[PDB]
């Protein structure tokens, strides 16, 4: 029994171009717990943090991967996670309308 | 505070 | 209101790679306040919310003492189970455990729970009466046997009826300004073009606490939440939460709509229109 992770990419406050902020990769609902989450500045890794492993009452785990950033009008941000239920590393680009 | 449990399966 | 203290343990086998990982975390309601990783040098159980830190050093040693036994005890449990099932010692497997208590508005003490899953499937659980065990399969019945001969339910019942509800009480006083204060969401509704013919219409609620919330979308007074896309509430980072709900709509017809956010800290529910 194994479910695959949902992923949301979003800013902590609404995006204001060139005003410091926080970008969040929320990885939730997955099992088994082993998982590979990477925040990426323009298709290359960012230095980020990771909250402690926890799980819901249905036992599916969840994590937050969060680094500070300053949005620009040009730079693309992305989250990349790997998991046994994923044939191919899944990528969600950051839409700042979401 | 945690539960002190000599809890084996 | 109503509150709960819970603890969440996780044990993961990493075949060939030394010991299994044992993570442990503590929650009062929706705010994490403790953690323990067995991948840590000289590893102790570190605070994770500010209101907890002024507890005596005795506490912290007494806890990492307990956390260290749990990691030891579990790594054997992984082994025990893997043979109840005859799986290969090369497989990665996970054992999860959860316990805690819910206390009522006056501290009534509503439920105590204590549950254990193996690889994400229910394994054995304490029952509502805090005196019996539901055991899922023939392997878990052996555990149920062991735990019935030792009076294990009785140790747990008195932990969940006394130590739990008492220390919970202690925690909320310490974090009186943090935990007992709700945080109303920031509402706002944006509009995102899709075409000449229709447009996404997002309803945002940001920065609220606690995590529970409801968003609702009403066309012409209807209740049109049927078509709406609601993402699942997500943490904000600052310890607050977010969620939004979109709709897609014929042009011109934006003024046809309403979004409604109900939340514990909203003195009366707010509704908004474009």
For chain A, domain boundaries: 6-93
> The domain A6-93 is classified under which CATH number: 1.10.132.20, 1.10.3720.10, 3.30.1360.230, 2.60.40.10?
2.60.40.10
| Triad C181, C99, C33: Cα angle to 5° | 40
Residue (of C194, C189, C210) closest to C257 by Cα position: C189
Identify residues of B whose CB sits under 8 angstroms from chain C CBs. Answer: 1-9
Rounded CA-CA distance A40/B3 in Å is 40
Q: How many Cα atoms within 13 Å fall on the side-chain side of residue C26? A: 22
Dihedral sign from CA coordinates of C155, C161, C164, C166: negative
Residues C97 and C204 reside in one and the same domain:
no
Which of C39, C96, C189, C235 best probes binding to A when mutated, by most A CB atoms within 10 angstroms? Answer: C235
State whether C103 and C200 are in the same domain: no
DSSP string over C31-86:
EEEEEE-TTSSS---EE-SGGGTTS-HHHHHHHHHHHHHHHHHHHHHHHHHHHHTT
What is the rounded CA–CA span in Å between residue A66 and residue C237? Answer: 7
SS (H, E, C) A31-73: ECCCCEEEEEECCEECCCEECCCEECCCCCEEEEEEEEECCCC
> Does C120 lie in the same domain as C13?
yes
Both C53 and C118 in one domain: the answer is: yes
Nearest to C120 among A8, A24, A31 (CB): A31
Q: What are the chain C neighbours of A33 within 8 Å (beta carbons)? A: 10, 12, 94
Total domains in the fold of chain C: 2
Q: Cβ B3–C73 below 8 Å, yes or no? A: no
Interface test with B, best of C118, C126, C152, C172 (most B CBs within 10 A): C152
Based on the domain organization, do C54 and C112 belong to the same domain? yes
C20, C161, C165, C181, C241 from C172: Cα distances, Å: 34, 17, 11, 11, 20
Cβ atoms within 10 A of the Cβ of A77, count? 23
Strands (E), chain C: 3-12, 21-28, 31-36, 46-47, 94-103, 111-118, 121-126, 133-135, 186-193, 198-208, 214-217, 229-230, 234-235, 241-246, 248-250, 259-262, 270-272
Q: Which two tokens stand for residue C69?
A: 């036994």
Nearest Cβ partner of C99 from B3, B6, B8? B3
Which among C181, C211, C233 is the end of a domain? Answer: C181
Same domain assignment for residues C10 and C104: yes
C87 and C218 in a common domain: no
For the purposes of burial, counting CB atoms within 10 Å of the CB of C77, is it exposed (0-12), middle (13-18) or buried (19 or more)? buried
Chain B residues touching C113 at Cβ < 8 A = none
User: Distance (Å) from the C-alpha of residue B1 to the closest C-alpha of chain C?
Assistant: 6
- Token pair, residue C248, equals 């897609």
What are the C-alpha distances in Å from C194 to residues C185, C200, C217? 27, 7, 19
CB-CB contact of C12 with C94 (8 Å): yes
| Residue whose structure tokens are 């945002």 | C204
By CA distance, what is C68's nearest residue in B?
A: B4
CB of C9 closer than 8 Å to CB of C26: no
Residues C168 and C215 in one domain: no
Q: CA quadruple C137, C138, C139, C145: dihedral positive or negative? A: positive
Give the span between the Cα atoms of C5 and C31, in whole angstroms.
10
Q: How far apart are CA C143 and CA A17, in angstroms?
A: 57
What residues in C contact B1, CB-CB < 8 Å? Answer: 59, 63, 163, 167
Same domain? C206 vs C150: no
Identify whether residues C273 and C176 lie together within a single domain.
no
- Give SS3 for C272: strand
State how far the Cα of C225 lies from the Cα of C260, in Å rounded to an integer: 11
Contact (Cβ atoms closer than 8 angstroms) between residue C2 and residue C102: yes
Measured distance CA(A95)–CA(C248) in Å, rounded: 17
Q: Are C231 and C205 in contact (CB under 8 A)?
A: no
Distance CA B6, CA C150 (A): 11
In the numeric block, which tokens belong to residue C78?
């992984």
Tokens at B8, concatenated: 């084996």
Rounded Cα distance, C196 and C173, in Å? 56
Surface-to-core class of residue A43, CB atoms within 10 Å of its CB (0-12 exposed, 13-18 middle, 19+ buried): exposed
Nearest-angstrom CA–CA distance, C209 and A98: 20
One domain, residues C156 and C209: no
Q: Indicate the residue among C181, C211, C239 that finishes a domain.
A: C181
CB pairs under 8 A between A and C: 74
| Together in a domain, C252 and C156 | no
Domain that holds residue C97: 1-181
What is the spatial distance between Cα C10 and Cα C71, in angstroms, rounded to a whole number? 9
Contact C114, C163 (CB under 8 A): no
Q: Which residues of A touch C231 (CB under 8 A)?
A: 8, 98
Identify the CA nearest to C234 among candidates C213, C248, C203: C213
Q: Would an 8 Å CB–CB cutoff place A77 in contact with chain C?
A: no
Q: How many helices (H) and strands (E) does chain B have?
A: 0, 0
> Among the three residues C159, C181, C203, which one is the final residue of a domain in this structure?
C181
Report d(CA A36, CA C211) in Å as an integer: 26
**CB of A65 closer than 8 Å to CB of A33:** no
The reply to whether residue C63 touches residue B4, judged by beta carbons under 8 angstroms, is no
Method for structure elucidation: X-ray
Distance CA C239, CA C36 (A): 19
**Cβ C23–A52 below 8 Å, yes or no?**
yes
In angstroms, the Cα distances linking A17 to C16, C19, C201 are: 47, 46, 22
* C74 to A82, C60, C80, C115, C159: CA distances (angstroms): 26, 21, 9, 14, 19
């Amino acid at each position: 029994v194994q479910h695959s992770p949902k992923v949301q990419v979003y800013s902590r406050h609404p995006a204001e171009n060139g005003k410091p902020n926080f970008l969040n990769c929320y990885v939730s609902g997955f099992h088994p717990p082993q998982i590979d989450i990477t925040l990426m500045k323009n298709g290359k890794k960012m230095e980020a943090e990771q909250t402690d492993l926890s799980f819901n009452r249905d036992w599916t785990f969840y994590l937050l991967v969060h680094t500070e950033f300053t949005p620009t009008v040009e730079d693309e941000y992305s989250c990349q996670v790997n998991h046994t239920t994923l044939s191919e590393p899944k990528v969600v680009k950051w839409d700042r309308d979401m | 505070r945690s539960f002190i449990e000599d809890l084996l399966f | 209101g109503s509150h709960s203290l819970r603890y969440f343990h996780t044990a993961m086998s990493r075949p060939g790679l030394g010991e299994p990982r044992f993570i442990s975390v503590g929650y009062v309601d929706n705010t994490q306040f403790v953690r323990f990783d067995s991948d840590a040098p000289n590893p102790k159980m570190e605070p994770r919310a500010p209101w907890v830190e002024q507890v005596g050093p005795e506490y912290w040693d007494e806890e990492t003492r307990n956390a260290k036994d749990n990691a030891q005890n579990f790594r054997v449990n992984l082994q025990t189970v893997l043979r109840y099932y005859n799986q290969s010692e090369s497989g990665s497997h996970s054992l999860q455990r959860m316990y805690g208590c819910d206390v009522g508005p006056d501290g009534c003490l509503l439920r105590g729970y204590s549950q254990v899953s193996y690889d994400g499937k229910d394994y054995i659980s304490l029952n509502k009466d805090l005196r019996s065990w539901t055991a899922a399969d023939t392997a878990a019945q052996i555990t149920r046997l062991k735990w019935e001969e030792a009076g294990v339910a009785e140790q747990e019942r008195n932990y969940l009826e006394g130590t739990c509800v008492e220390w919970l009480a202690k925690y909320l006083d310490m974090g009186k300004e943090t935990l007992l204060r709700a945080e109303s969401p920031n509402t706002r509704m944006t509009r995102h073009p899709i075409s000449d013919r229709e447009v996404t219409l997002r309803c945002w609620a940001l920065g609220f606490y606690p995590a529970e919330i409801t968003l609702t979308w009403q066309r012409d007074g209807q209740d049109h939440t049927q078509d709406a896309e609601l993402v699942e509430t997500r943490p904000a980072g600052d310890g607050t939460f977010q969620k939004w709900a979109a709709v897609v709509v014929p042009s011109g017809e934006e003024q046809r709509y309403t979004c409604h956010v109900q939340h514990e800290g909203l003195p009366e529910p707010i509704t908004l229109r474009w």
